[PDB]
RNA sequence: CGCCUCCUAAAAGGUAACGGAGGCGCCCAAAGGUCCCCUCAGGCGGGACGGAAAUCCGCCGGAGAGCGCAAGGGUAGAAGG
RNA sequence: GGCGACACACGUGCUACAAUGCCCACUACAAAGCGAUGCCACCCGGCAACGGGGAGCUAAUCGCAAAAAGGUGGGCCCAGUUCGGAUUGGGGUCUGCAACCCGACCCCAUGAAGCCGGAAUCGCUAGUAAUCGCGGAUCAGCCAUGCCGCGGUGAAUACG
């Protein structure tokens, strides 16, 4: 599990690879490679273990990633669900939360169609 | 959400009653139509009845539900499911 | 599936189901009934039952009319059948020469 | 026998603290490690690629000991299981190999465990033994991403001469077993 | 393309501006 | 031990990222690991990596005391 | 309709009825000979996927398991692995 | 408060499933319109939305304004991906008395279905179709992917 908890794609440029971490998108990819002075274009197979632990150390301390991140988002939802607010209710019934129409669509949230 | 440069909005007529009850010691039930008012730290521990268009829903405020709006806790539609 | 509209009228699930069992007679011809649409309506004279149905060999459009909503529906079905039977057999007429 | 840090740590630091904490009157009375038994429940190798020789090669790299096949006591319908079928691996570690395995387990393995919050304090025999289970073999330093085809974990039995969970808790934590609660 | 906000093309289609399409 | 069926155990260095070196025994004499007990957040006191946040919410808003009284 | 097991069968053997219940018409190249080693079912507690039940660990557990197949006898101080 | 509901069903559309493509950076070429508690140059703070300064223009003068496809370079290398941008978490902006139900926008993270679509079915005969962007009415703001316009690039085919 090289970095950071996840084994990022070798053969790929380090900036693109880093996005294969939960919590690290393209924005944060360009950030960590500056702050550690590593060429963003270089492939993960071509990193130095010096650079790896360099890249590793910064990325794992600056931001919340993978497990602990998922834990929070859930707790945040678990919270809204428990305090019983409207946003909460939508999560409890698995319905859309950001005020979308549910007469049609809402399939991403509802899942594939249930016959009647 | 509402600009941080602006206020933390409470309808004053709702808020006033809170502070009034805080001073003398709380609490009687407060019937309000102010769904748009933020739950504010001064309100915690009270039970405010929030009109949802039909009924006034009794809402006991807690430490968890501070940042929210009052309407969020008195749902406006009755839905028990389909079929 | 099948859609039913009750224009400026209220009807029941029962009545809706009745119509579905009545349109079902068209299943006889073993051809695809594509988006059948029934419109129930009330005139001063009686009820009106409209329908538009498409099939691989054409469209069916028919209107039934009668004081009794069920008869209006039955006549709608009768007109739809006659059309469907023509759609399904008219091509056979000129097989010779 | 080999000079190994953990083993040395047991005699030099752990034993005196235990003698202290419970006041044994005999040197033999103090909690000792009897064996570490590793078990791969497998049985995903029942039929199919019943070559679990891949797994045995993995276990052997981890322990330095070649595991022995376990076979079904009886036949079972629902697990799709006939008597005598090769369903798992089991290796009994003692003495120097046992110390070496635990040594790497504490220092390296458990840290590499995903979202590790510490061992489960309640997982004690009641008779002074402890058990923990793993989801992956990748946890161990011997195993790399390259050389592994699929994810198979294991069961680990740590057997102690301690009569109670209390005593066993004392010994294991002293050795460096990291407990959450 | 045009549906992704975090891109130049998306901000054009939507008629807005930002980091991914500045003015 | 039965001969020829076991991997030989040799002296070994396990090298962690934090600079920790572990003198131990293994079937591979040199090994690199991303983490060890010496640096792992759970072990090191309670070194709370990125978030030693402490919620921060929910009265943690305090923006501010400005409503009238 | 021959054969095997139990009961009827009256504590030796034997004992009938169109009396009460079940089996057989095979099988095994080891499921045979011998030497060596090993000991169950089950209950409780513990253990990734793993479940009432797969494999692992501990404790209790004389035989209630096993012994190809009916039943009976026998049997771990082995006939069982 | 509801018209925004949501086991379902149909109609119209938007964005797509990628390399004749996607992303970054630099660089060209329109038309028709709109604009004094309006359109906003330019400056500065902010990654940004935006905010604070501030000139011009009763507008062939000043402003919206940059058109986009394109062009030139660089990256991506056939993968559910640097395709796609749904869903959700968190943080902000602006309008407005007020954005819980029920606004638009920005930023961080999340990164779904979808590998070109059954029966069936729509449009178009030339500056048309296709594809690209620009404006306006309504309008505090906007749920516009709609509507009415505007130009850019620019086909295939018609035996009968
Ligand atoms: Mg990512
Ligand atoms: Mg809605
Ligand atoms: Mg209908
Ligand atoms: Mg009606
Ligand atoms: Mg009706
Ligand atoms: Mg008509
Ligand atoms: Mg008839
Ligand atoms: Mg006719
Ligand atoms: Mg000793
Ligand atoms: Mg316990
Ligand atoms: Mg013990
Ligand atoms: Mg490893
Ligand atoms: Mg994209
Ligand atoms: Mg020898
Ligand atoms: Mg007898
Ligand atoms: Mg007898
Ligand atoms: Mg006798
Ligand atoms: Mg006798
Ligand atoms: Mg005799
Ligand atoms: Mg007879
Ligand atoms: Mg044999
Ligand atoms: Mg033999
Ligand atoms: Mg047992
Ligand atoms: Mg159990
Ligand atoms: Mg389990
Ligand atoms: Mg079990
Ligand atoms: Mg028996
Ligand atoms: Mg309303
Ligand atoms: Mg409406
Ligand atoms: Mg329906
Ligand atoms: Mg459909
Ligand atoms: Mg649309
Ligand atoms: Mg459509
Ligand atoms: Mg492809
Ligand atoms: Mg994906
Ligand atoms: Mg798919
Ligand atoms: Mg992508
Ligand atoms: Mg949010
Ligand atoms: Mg709203
Ligand atoms: Mg197509
Ligand atoms: Mg296409
Ligand atoms: Mg067709
Ligand atoms: Mg024409
Ligand atoms: Mg396009
Ligand atoms: Mg437009
Ligand atoms: Mg306008
Ligand atoms: Mg407008
Ligand atoms: Mg909306
Ligand atoms: Zn370390």
Curated annotation (Swiss-Prot), chain A:
An annotated GO BP: translation
Superkingdom: Bacteria
Location of region: Disordered: 94-116
Key words of the record: Ribonucleoprotein, Ribosomal protein, RNA-binding, rRNA-binding, tRNA-binding
One Pfam family of this chain: Ribosomal_S13
GO terms assigned for molecular function: rRNA binding; structural constituent of ribosome; tRNA binding
Gene Ontology cellular-component terms listed: cytosol; small ribosomal subunit
Family: Belongs to the universal ribosomal protein uS13 family.
Subunit-level organization: Part of the 30S ribosomal subunit. Forms a loose heterodimer with protein S19. Forms two bridges to the 50S subunit in the 70S ribosome, contacting protein L5 and the 23S rRNA; these bridges are straddled by the 5S rRNA.
HAMAP family: Ribosomal_uS13
Role played: Located at the top of the head of the 30S subunit, it contacts several helices of the 16S rRNA. In the 70S ribosome structure it contacts the 23S rRNA (bridge B1a) and protein L5 of the 50S subunit (bridge B1b), connecting the top of the two subunits; these bridges are in contact with the A site and P site tRNAs respectively and are implicated in movement during ribosome translocation. Separately contacts the tRNAs in the A and P sites.
Name this protein carries in UniProt: Small ribosomal subunit protein uS13
Swiss-Prot record, chain C:
Gene3D superfamilies: Ribosome hibernation promotion factor-like (3.30.160.100)
BP GO annotations: dormancy process; negative regulation of translational elongation; negative regulation of translational initiation; response to cold
CDD domains in the cross-refs: RaiA (cd00552)
Knocked-out gene: effects: Non-essential gene, increased formation of inactive 100S ribosomes in stationary phase, which persist longer than in wild-type. Double hpr-yfiA deletion mutants form 90S ribosomes. A quadruple yfiA-hpf-rmf-sra knockout strain is significantly outcompeted by wild-type after 4 days growth. No visible effect on viability or growth rate at 37 or 10 degrees Celsius, slight effect on bulk translation and timing of expression of some cold-shock proteins.
Region spans: Interaction with 16S rRNA: 22-25, 82-90
GO molecular function terms attached to this record: ribosomal small subunit binding; rRNA binding
Protein induction: During stationary phase (at protein level). Also by cold stress, remains ribosome-associated for the 4 hours tested, then disappears when cells are warmed (at protein level).
Database matches in InterPro entries: HPF/YfiA_ribosome-assoc, RHF-like, RHF/RaiA
GO CC, any one term: cytosolic small ribosomal subunit
Keyword entries, A-Z: Acetylation, RNA-binding, rRNA-binding, Stress response, Translation regulation
Family statement: Belongs to the HPF/YfiA ribosome-associated protein family. YfiA subfamily.
PANTHER family the UniProt entry points to: 30S RIBOSOMAL PROTEIN, RIBOSOME-ASSOCIATED INHIBITOR A
Protein name (database record): Ribosome-associated inhibitor A
The organism of origin for this protein: Escherichia coli (strain K12)
Gene: raiA
Swiss-Prot record, chain E:
Similarity annotation: Belongs to the bacterial ribosomal protein bTHX family.
The UniProt record lists the keyword RNA-binding: yes
GO CC term, one of those recorded: ribosome
Annotated organism of origin: Thermus thermophilus (strain ATCC 27634 / DSM 579 / HB8)
Keywords of this entry: Ribonucleoprotein, Ribosomal protein, RNA-binding, rRNA-binding
GO molecular function: rRNA binding
Subunit structure: Part of the 30S ribosomal subunit.
Protein name: Small ribosomal subunit protein bTHX
Any matching Pfam family: Thx
Biased composition (Basic residues): 1-12
Positions of region (Disordered): 1-23
Biological role: Binds at the top of the head of the 30S subunit. It stabilizes a number of different RNA elements and thus is important for subunit structure.
Curated annotation (Swiss-Prot), chain F:
GO cellular component, one term: ribonucleoprotein complex
Record's keyword annotation contains Acyltransferase: no
GO BP: any one term: translation
Binding locations of Zn(2+): 16, 18, 36, 39
Family to which the UniProt record says this protein belongs: Belongs to the bacterial ribosomal protein bL31 family. Type A subfamily.
HAMAP family named in the record: Ribosomal_bL31_1
Role according to the record: Binds the 23S rRNA.
Name used for this protein in its record: Large ribosomal subunit protein bL31
Organism: Thermus thermophilus (strain ATCC 27634 / DSM 579 / HB8)
């Amino acid at each position: 599990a090289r970095i950071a908890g996840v084994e990022i794609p070798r053969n790929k440029r380090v900036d693109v690879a880093l996005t294969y971490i939960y919590g690290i998108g393209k924005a944060r990819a360009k950030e960590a490679l500056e702050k550690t002075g590593i060429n963003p274009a270089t492939r993960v197979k071509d990193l130095t273990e010096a650079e790896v632990v360099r890249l590793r150390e910064y990325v794992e301390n600056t931001w919340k990633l993978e497990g602990e991140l998922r834990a929070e988002v859930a707790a945040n939802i678990k919270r809204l669900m428990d305090i019983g607010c409207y946003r909460g209710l939508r999560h409890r019934r698995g319905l859309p939360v950001r005020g979308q129409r549910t007469r049609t669509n809402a399939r991403t949230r509802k899942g594939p169609r249930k016959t009647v | 959400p509402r600009s941080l440069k602006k206020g933390v909005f409470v309808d004053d007529h709702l808020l006033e009653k809170v502070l009034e009850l805080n001073a003398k010691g709380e609490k009687r039930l407060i019937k309000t139509w102010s769904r748009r008012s933020t739950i504010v730290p001064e309100m915690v521990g009270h039970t405010i009845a929030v009109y949802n268009g039909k009924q006034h829903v009794p809402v006991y405020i807690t430490e968890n539900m501070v940042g929210h709006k009052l309407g969020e806790f008195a749902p406006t539609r009755t839905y028990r499911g389909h079929g | 599936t099948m859609n039913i509209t009750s224009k400026q009228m209220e009807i029941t699930p029962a009545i809706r189901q009745h119509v579905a069992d009545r349109l079902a007679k068209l299943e006889k011809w073993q051809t695809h009934l594509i988006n059948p649409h029934i419109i129930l309506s009330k005139e001063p004279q009686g009820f009106v039952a409209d329908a538009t149905i498409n099939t691989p060999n054409g469209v069916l459009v028919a209107s039934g009319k009668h004081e009794d909503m069920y008869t209006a529906i039955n006549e709608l079905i009768n007109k739809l059948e006659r059309q469907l039977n023509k759609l399904q057999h008219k091509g056979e007429a000129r097989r010779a020469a | 026998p080999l000079d190994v840090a953990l083993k040395r740590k047991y005699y030099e630091e752990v034993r005196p603290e235990l003698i202290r904490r419970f006041g044994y009157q005999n040197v033999w009375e103090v909690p000792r490690l009897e064996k570490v038994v590793i078990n791969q429940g497998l049985g995903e190798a029942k039929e199919d690629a019943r070559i679990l020789e891949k797994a045995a090669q993995e276990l052997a790299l981890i322990t330095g000991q070649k595991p022995a096949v376990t076979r079904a006591k009886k036949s079972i319908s629902n697990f799709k299981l006939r008597k005598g079928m090769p369903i798992g691996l089991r290796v009994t570690l003692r003495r120097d190999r046992m110390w070496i395995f635990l040594e790497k387990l504490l220092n390296v393995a458990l840290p590499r465990i995903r979202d590790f919050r510490g061992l489960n304090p309640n997982s004690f025999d009641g008779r002074g033994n402890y058990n923990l289970g793993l989801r992956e073999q990748l946890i161990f330093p011997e195993i790399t991403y390259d050389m592994v085809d699929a994810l198979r974990g294991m069961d680990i039995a740590v057997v102690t001469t301690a009569e109670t969970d209390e005593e066993a808790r004392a010994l294991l934590e002293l050795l460096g077993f990291p407990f959450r609660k | 393309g045009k549906g992704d906000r975090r891109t130049r093309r998306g901000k054009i289609w939507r008629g807005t501006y930002g980091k991914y399409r500045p003015r | 031990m039965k001969e020829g069926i076991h991997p030989k155990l040799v002296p070994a260095r396990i090298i962690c990222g934090c600079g920790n070196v572990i003198e131990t025994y293994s079937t591979k004499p040199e090994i690199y690991v991303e983490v060890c007990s010496k640096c792992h957040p759970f072990y090191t006191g309670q070194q709370r990596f990125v978030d030693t946040e402490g919620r921060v919410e929910r009265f943690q808003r305090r923006y501010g005391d400005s409503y009238r009284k």
